Write a protein that binds this ligand. Structure first.
Ligand code: SF4
Ligand code: SF4
Ligand code: SF4
Ligand code: SF4
Ligand code: FES
Ligand SMILES: [Ca+2]
Lengths: 905, 586, 145
């Protein structure tokens, strides 16, 4: 398609509207109510241009560039006098009721309305009358509400209802008294409600967790990082001021997590700012806790490790690839144990075998939205992999998208698309032990135990392909539902099967693999997605090693007299009493961690490791994509006594001091090269990000904006002399503003989006090749493995049906986005959002036990009696008791286990 | 058509002459807001174009400026030849009252240009600075050594990949070995500086500590007895990195740094920068703004000229007029403090106007100064300036004609004492200087020390006349333009209107967004012609800030004019130039 | 749009009333006598149109109340200079294609027809000088001439 903007010819896409096409060309058109992820509605009337019928036309007519397709031979003008006057008039009309609030507004300096007021050239007020006002609502602990600043652009309601699928936010009222919020005061119930702080172009919805310790955008030190709160691996921009992690912003990755994060990643960063974190190496000597610096810590640790007869290392899926590899090199490959349980490791290795050996393509997070039917087996996606649930919602709305496409309606005209596809949607079949948050859009939901969900998957795979093993004992109603699922999956051009290791069942993963293989054998374009547990679960599975139980037996038998635990609390993967006894028996325990865990009391040496905000490294997400996260700030810049290093730095220096009695720390690229050389399965992490010698025309990449302030006063209370700027020898970024952050710079890692005239998160449009697409020079991250040429065989281990045995209670896992993650519960802002710890019971089981809803019952697990209140779960199958996984005192390894003497306290 | 409009200047006769001489495809005409024809010339034709411009019927006789630009980070290079670096040559024809900017594009690896010193001798120091700050080598230079930074310096400071701030570098540690090594570097060696040495040529060191108000600097002197056979000035001891700070500060926040370029000039130094930024922004200031800026420029011009005359008289040997001239400076300082709130660096001019309105009672203080000044000036003349000992120390000392002033880029009183009537306020009028009735004094043809001092006295009297006209006719109106890019907006509308608050919020935090263009403004400063050449890449910071100062030209003209004279003649010549080392180094 | 006595001899067709600068509409004409002030009538019309906006799109929702407040100021004689220019710009920028639907063009048709035909009644409301800012002590204002 050929367009002519202000007499200049451009080649665009005819399927795009004029606004996104002109923004992709670098032209500036003001806009409020259009979003690339949400489509065009024509509400704010800000994107007006002047369209001409032909080339020799002078009058023209004001059209809206978001509502006008960028067809071939189009003639428009942006800098026309009438279009400029109308855009300034629209800004003026929006400014008639706006409060004089910019100094006391958290959106100041980050405001789209500020940028568009300046861009339209409106700086003189002639409106002399009153301004309308609105009371505010309490929207919970994460979102702060201020309705006076609203411009009625309907972005919040469109995102929250059409895109996110939420129900409790809406628009109320009339002509100029439109109110946007909840019908009553209460917490916003959506798991993706935190994206409202970037969706809203004004300061109506603001980050309250950031608003506590608020600082402006220009004062932030930003980094490109990966969110560590689950396995999806969404790209984030952590921003820091005065030595504390101030905010998490969404970093655009067109392949993974383009515009949106979930609430756990956006608000669960508060564990970094905890005051109980280790900041210096501490050595235990009797009842004394001697604080050392790094050199004598390495010397002492080297002597005690050299005096030991066998040293073992227990890793974690929390730690990066480099840190786990450094521990594995320090203790040896045969003495390296993964920090997860045997069942967790078996499920994770089976998921990895399915992903990189099953011959079925694993889609990216953005690619999930283009699938025609979704079957979720066992995995509570909204509570474990929430962004996959959001992409599943988009894939479900794909049917309305294609129905509107069949009527020659453009893909950006979202209102007509939703009008045509009223309630028709792509098939979604979710299985769980109880209700999920995807039940409102699911074609079917199966509330059953994990054995029954696995049997349903095996029956689906057998009905799709008769070479798969059959299931005997299917009820006719269950057979009818299986036939419905099979008829939906067989007629889908792009079926998608989503499972994971959080269900606590190997057979669920086997059934999902069988369904994917049966769909692949029919020639369908089937994709499979496995949801892991932690941020680097896939990387720890690829690296491999023994389980935690083998390490505990090695400690208990006396064969290992020294244990090095890397960033693992060890209570989430095994029983606490066994771990405590095995660690107390060992004469040397060294815990390398950034959080104050419970096993540090028995630890002889504690190494103050760095979190993701203070370290660089590589993490492998659930799809096998290696992603590099970069250090945000130097911990020792403010507190000069703080000795907090990277975990791989700690362990590599320890290995060097053990081998040659000299302290060499590392460079990060050396550890990357060591990983690539020693582990050929992790050889793709070299190309995840360029090395520390990468420059943009000779200069580094800036972590903080060019208008960063306070440089001669941030440390003036400690010392009036300005200290040395922190040097970054590990990566290509610099701890200063003397770098490159141009939108046209040839790079893939963007610490933050800023353009002249675009201070809001809309500068990502300037940082993309086309608006709403990918990054201009490719998205960061590289897939570790390609799709295999040949697949697996059918798993013939069909489990027997769930039999409720008397006196034993099967623990059904319940996951919560706020509470199940290990580090997110440590964030103090989560405790208001974290649920109370209950236990779920069937009505029949509660009536048999004589217990009501809310009464306290006590159960003993591994000789430990604990009491919890009771809810009555209607969808939970009898013979099962429902436990919330990852909570205080409930380890995630309890999923799929059994319970004894569960009785009323 | 407004004066800030983008023009290609294809109607200039020099463009047609170059078309008829070198051909249409030989060069590229660039449309800028500089007001000058910008011609991108190929490198191998640069000396041919220079010869052709030097041999025109009305020739381009003065190399106004010569410097470089790092074009690697420049994104908006539409209509421009492909370049990693560029070298620009600003040349002035006074007979036509026109000027032209030649530009030579350079790749990153082939950073060599033919030297321009065979056509203009000021290209020596200009190319030495261009090599020092950008690494561009000039083939055929007599000595291409560093002129701003020490010889033991690594890297070129004005490149875009060079870190600007000292906090980026390690803090300054002075050890014994470091002190010895840097003291060895400052030692003078006859062979390295191109002295080209008789068993009697002794060597003399003047600085670098300097007992005068105009900076600290060195002159190394080759002496036959008392006669100066050769000399080369050593500068760079006062280098503040002001252009690198221009690339480091926003448009609004750079104005205090523009103040300290010529620290005896103040608002005179602020004027060309804000005029060039207003050209970039498309801002035409109202008439009251123009009259206020003219009034403050003339006040600071009288201050600078008073200090210059007092310092010259003190350097001759009479020490009382410095006391009285600093009392008159205190009267000027009273008025300037009342208007702006500061004495020497007011930083009071703004993009689109001035920081505040004139306070109530400014006319009273201007009346006291206008009544005070002329009797004091007449007493200065009768007590010291007509003294025959001062005349013997000054008349005929370091004299040059129109050709030597033109070939060395000398401007101000040194140029006008050669008889050349070239003042910026009358040739290329700016800031409403065409509405003021004043005369431009000129000399007889010879630029003595005494002739320059008497000319500066005459411009002091003419500035008093301009101040009287400003006092009698000051318009009633706004002190700031009504443009959306007026930085900052008027304060009360910021304090009670949300759109004005938004404009102020974004203009003082992120900075105002100048659209990507090039602008240029030259003004008649207190010491000559001062110019700002500002390249904007569409951001809130300057992509390139080039500050041309006349003191650079005068310090470069010193060895040609003081050769064959005495050391006391050199002291008198230094006292009669009206320079400062911040102007030289900046 | 309002029409005068000279337009009374016009056939009630779409093309005939359209060529006079008005619309045939529902063809139910409403007659205004000499006792009715045009400013009060247009204020009533714009108050109806401003309170019956659906709130979707910016120009109607945020410019009809501005016209209502300007007409209220003109009704009590508190009008300031530039009010009628603001009303004319509100007419021009709320026409067809500028708003999401046709409610606001029909809103601004009576306002522009009354400004065109009965401007002397709108001139009578402008009595006070224009004042948007109050004095702030210690800051000299920008006296825009
Ligand atoms: S939302 Fe934007 S325009 Fe409104 S008060 Fe906040 S910063 Fe100012
Ligand atoms: S609250 Fe924000 S996103 Fe919602 S309509 Fe108002 S300005 Fe738009
Ligand atoms: S889905 Fe997972 S990786 Fe993404 S923001 Fe949420 S917790 Fe972080
Ligand atoms: S013009 Fe129509 S769509 Fe726009 S706010 Fe008014 S009634 Fe609603
Ligand atoms: S962006 Fe087009 S009308 Fe809102
Ligand atoms: Ca580091």
């Amino acid at each position: 398609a050929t367009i002519h903007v202000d007499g200049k010819e451009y080649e665009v896409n005819g399927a795009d509207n004029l606004l996104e096409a002109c923004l992709s060309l670098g032209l500036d058109i003001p806009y409020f109510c259009w979003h690339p992820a949400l489509g065009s509605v024509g509400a704010c009337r800000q994107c007006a241009v002047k369209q001409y019928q032909n080339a020799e036309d002078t009058r023209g007519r004001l059209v809206m560039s978001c509502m006008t397709p960028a067809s071939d031979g189009t003639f428009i003008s942006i800098d026309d006098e009438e279009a400029k006057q109308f855009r300034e008039s629209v800004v003026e009309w929006l400014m008639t009721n706006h409060p004089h609030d910019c100094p006391v507004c958290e959106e100041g300096g980050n405001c789209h309305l500020q940028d568009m007021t300046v861009m339209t050239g409106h700086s003189f007020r002639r409106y002399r009358f009153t301004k309308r006002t609105h009371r505010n609502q309490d929207l919970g602990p994460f979102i702060s509400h201020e309705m006076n600043r609203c411009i009625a652009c309907y972005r919040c309601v469109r995102y929250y209802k059409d895109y996110a699928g939420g129900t409790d936010l809406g628009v109320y009222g009339a002509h100029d008294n439109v109110y946007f919020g909840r019908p009553e005061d209460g917490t916003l119930e959506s798991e993706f409600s935190g994206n409202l702080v970037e969706i809203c172009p004004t300061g109506v919805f603001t980050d309250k967790t950031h608003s506590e310790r608020y600082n402006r955008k220009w004062d932030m030190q930003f980094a490109p990082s990966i969110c560590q709160q689950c396995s999806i691996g969404c790209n984030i921009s952590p921003g820091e001021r005065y030595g504390e992690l101030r905010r998490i912003e969404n970093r655009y990755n067109g392949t993974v997590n383009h515009y949106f994060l979930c609430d756990r990643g956006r608000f669960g960063y508060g564990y970094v700012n905890l005051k109980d974190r280790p900041r210096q190496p501490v050595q235990r000597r009797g009842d004394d806790f001697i604080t050392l610096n790094a050199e004598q810590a390495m010397q002492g640790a080297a002597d005690i490790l050299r005096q030991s007869k066998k040293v073992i290392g227990i890793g974690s899926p929390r730690a990066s690839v480099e840190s786990n590899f450094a521990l594995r090199e320090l203790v040896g490959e045969e003495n390296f144990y993964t920090g997860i349980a045997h069942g967790e490791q078996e499920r994770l290795q089976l998921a990895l075998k399915v992903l990189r050996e099953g011959g079925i393509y694993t889609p990216a997070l953005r690619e999930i939205e283009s699938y025609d039917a979704v079957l979720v087996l066992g995995e509570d996606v909204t509570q474990t992999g929430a962004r996959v649930a959001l992409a599943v919602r988009q894939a479900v709305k794909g049917k309305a998208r294609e129905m509107a496409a069949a009527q020659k309606v453009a893909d950006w005209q979202i209102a007509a698309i939703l009008n045509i596809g009223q309630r028709a949607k792509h098939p979604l079949f979710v299985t769980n032990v109880d209700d999920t948050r995807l039940d409102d859009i699911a074609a079917w939901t199966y509330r059953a135990p994990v054995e029954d969900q696995a049997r349903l998957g095996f029956a689906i795979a057998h009905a799709l392909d008769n070479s798969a093993p059959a299931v005997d004992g299917i009820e006719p109603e269950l057979q009818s539902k299986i036939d419905v699922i099979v008829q939906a999956l067989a007629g889908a051009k792009k079926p998608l099967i989503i499972s994971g290791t959080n269900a606590g069942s190997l057979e669920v993963i086997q059934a999902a693999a069988n369904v994917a293989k049966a769909l692949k054998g029919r020639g369908a374009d089937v994709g499979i997605t496995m949801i892991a547990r932690s941020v680097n679960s896939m990387g720890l599975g690829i690296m491999g090693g023994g389980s935690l139980e083998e390490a505990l037996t090695e400690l208990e038998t006396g064969r290992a007299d020294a244990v090095v635990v890397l960033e693992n609390d060890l209570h989430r993967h095994a029983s606490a009493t066994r771990v405590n006894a095995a660690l107390a028996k060992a004469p040397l325990v060294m815990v390398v961690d950034h959080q104050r865990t419970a096993i540090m009391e028995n630890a002889h040496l504690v190494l103050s490791a760095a979190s993701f905000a203070e370290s660089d490294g590589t993490v492998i997400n659930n799809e096998g994509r290696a992603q590099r996260f970069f250090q945000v700030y130097d911990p020792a810049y403010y507190d000069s006594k703080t000795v907090m290093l990277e975990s791989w730095r700690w362990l590599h220096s320890l290995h060097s001091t053990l081998l040659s009695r000299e302290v060499d720390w590392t460079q990060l690229d050396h550890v990357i090269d060591a990983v690539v050389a020693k582990i050929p399965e992790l050889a793709g992490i070299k190309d995840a990000a360029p090395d520390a010698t990468f420059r943009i025309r000779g200069q580094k990449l800036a972590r903080e904006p060019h208008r960063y302030s306070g440089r001669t006063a941030m440390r003036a209370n400690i010392s009036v002399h300005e200290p040395r700027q922190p040097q970054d020898i590990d990566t290509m970024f610099t701890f200063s503003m003397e770098g490159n952050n141009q939108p046209t710079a040839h790079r893939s890692q963007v610490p933050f989006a800023w353009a002249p005239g675009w201070n809001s998160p809309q500068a990502w449009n300037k940082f993309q090749d086309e608006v709403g697409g990918k990054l201009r020079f490719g998205d960061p991250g590289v897939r570790l493995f390609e799709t295999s040429e040949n697949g697996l065989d059918y798993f013939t281990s069909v489990p027997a049906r769930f039999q409720p045995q008397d006196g034993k209670w099967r623990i059904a896992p319940y996951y919560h986005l706020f509470g199940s993650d290990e580090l997110s519960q440590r964030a103090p802002v989560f405790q208001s959002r974290m649920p109370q710890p209950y236990i779920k019971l069937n009505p029949a089981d509660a009536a048999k036990l004589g217990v009501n809803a809310g009464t306290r019952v006590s159960f003993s697990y591994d000789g430990n009696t604990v009491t919890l209140p009771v809810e009555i779960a209607e969808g939970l199958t009898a013979g099962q008791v429902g436990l919330p996984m990852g909570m205080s005192g409930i380890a995630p390894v309890l999923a799929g286990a059994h319970l004894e003497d569960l009785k009323e306290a | 058509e407004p004066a800030w409009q983008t023009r290609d200047h294809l109607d200039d006769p020099v463009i047609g002459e170059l078309r008829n001489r070198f051909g249409p495809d030989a060069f590229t005409v660039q449309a800028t807001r500089t007001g000058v024809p910008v011609v991108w010339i190929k490198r191998e034709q640069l000396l041919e174009v220079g010869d052709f411009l030097k041999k025109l019927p009305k020739p381009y006789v003065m190399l106004f400026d010569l410097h470089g630009m790092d074009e690697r980070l420049r994104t908006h290079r539409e209509g421009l030849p492909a370049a990693d670096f560029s070298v620009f040559y600003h040349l002035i024809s006074i007979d036509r009252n026109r000027d032209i900017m030649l530009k030579v594009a350079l790749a990153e690896n082939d950073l060599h240009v033919p030297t321009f010193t065979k056509l203009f001798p000021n290209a020596n120091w200009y190319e030495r600075e261009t090599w020092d700050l950008f690494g561009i080598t000039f083939d055929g230079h007599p000595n291409l050594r560093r002129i701003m930074m020490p010889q033991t310096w690594k890297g070129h400071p004005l490149r875009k990949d060079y870190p600007a701030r000292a906090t980026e570098f390690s803090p300054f540690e002075l050890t014994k070995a470091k002190q010895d090594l840097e003291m060895e570097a400052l030692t003078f060696k006859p062979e390295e500086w191109g002295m080209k040495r008789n068993e009697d040529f002794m060597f003399l060191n003047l600085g670098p500590n300097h007992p005068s108000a105009h900076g600290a600097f060195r002159i190394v002197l080759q002496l036959d007895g008392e006669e100066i056979v050769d000399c080369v000035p050593d500068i760079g001891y006062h280098h503040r990195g002001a252009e690198k700070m221009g690339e480091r500060q926003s448009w609004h926040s750079y104005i205090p740094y523009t103040d300290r370029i010529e620290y005896l000039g103040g608002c005179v130094n602020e004027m060309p920068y804000v005029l060039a930024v207003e050209k970039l922004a498309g801002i035409t200031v109202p008439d009251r703004v123009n009259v206020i800026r003219v009034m403050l420029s003339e006040l600071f011009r009288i201050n600078s000229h008073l200090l210059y005359i007092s310092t010259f008289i003190q350097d001759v040997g009479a020490m009382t007029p410095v006391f009285f001239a600093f009392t008159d400076r205190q009267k000027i300082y009273d008025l300037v403090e009342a208007i702006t709130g500061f004495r020497m660096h007011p930083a009071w001019f703004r993009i689109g106007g001035v920081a505040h309105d004139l306070p109530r009672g400014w006319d009273r203080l201007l009346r006291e100064f206008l009544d005070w000044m002329p009797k004091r000036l007449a007493s200065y003349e009768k007590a010291a300036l007509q003294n025959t000992i001062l005349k013997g120390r000054s008349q005929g000392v370091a004299a040059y004609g129109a050709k030597e002033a033109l070939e060395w880029g000398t401007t101000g009183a040194g140029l006008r004492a050669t008889g050349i009537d070239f003042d910026v306020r009358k040739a290329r009028p700016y800031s409403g200087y065409e509405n003021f009735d004043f005369e431009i004094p000129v000399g007889g043809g010879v630029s003595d020390c005494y002739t320059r001092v008497m000319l500066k006295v005459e411009e002091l009297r003419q500035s008093l006349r301009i101040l009287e006209q400003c006092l009698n006719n000051m318009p009633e109106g706004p002190f700031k333009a009504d443009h959306p890019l007026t930085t900052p907006p008027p304060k009360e509308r910021t304090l009670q209107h949300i759109e004005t608050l938004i404009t102020h919020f974004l203009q003082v935090s992120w900075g105002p967004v100048m659209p990507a263009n090039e602008s240029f403004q030259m003004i008649e400063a207190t010491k000559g012609i001062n110019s700002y050449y500002l390249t904007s890449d569409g951001s809130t910071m300057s992509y390139r800030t080039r500050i041309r100062t006349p003191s650079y030209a005068h310090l470069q003209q010193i060895p040609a004019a003081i050769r064959g004279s005495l050391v006391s003649d050199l002291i008198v010549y230094l006292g009669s130039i009206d320079f400062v080392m911040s102007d030289v180094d900046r | 749009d309002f029409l005068t006595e000279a337009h009374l001899d016009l056939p009630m067709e779409f093309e005939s009333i359209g060529k006079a600068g008005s619309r045939l509409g529902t063809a139910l004409a409403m007659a205004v006598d000499h006792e009715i002030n045009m400013v009060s009538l247009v204020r009533n019309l714009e108050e109806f149109f401003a309170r019956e906006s659906c709130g979707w799109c910016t120009p109607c929702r945020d410019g009809l109340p501005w016209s209502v407040k300007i007409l209220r100021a003109l009704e009590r004689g508190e009008g300031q200079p530039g009010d009628i220019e603001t009303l004319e710009q509100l007419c021009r920028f709320l026409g067809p294609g500028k708003t999401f639907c046709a409610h606001a063009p029909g809103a601004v048709e009576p306002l522009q027809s009354a400004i065109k035909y009965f401007r002397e009644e709108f001139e009578a409301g402008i009595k006070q000088p224009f004042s948007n800012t109050h004095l702030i002590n210690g800051i000299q204002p920008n006296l825009l001439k």
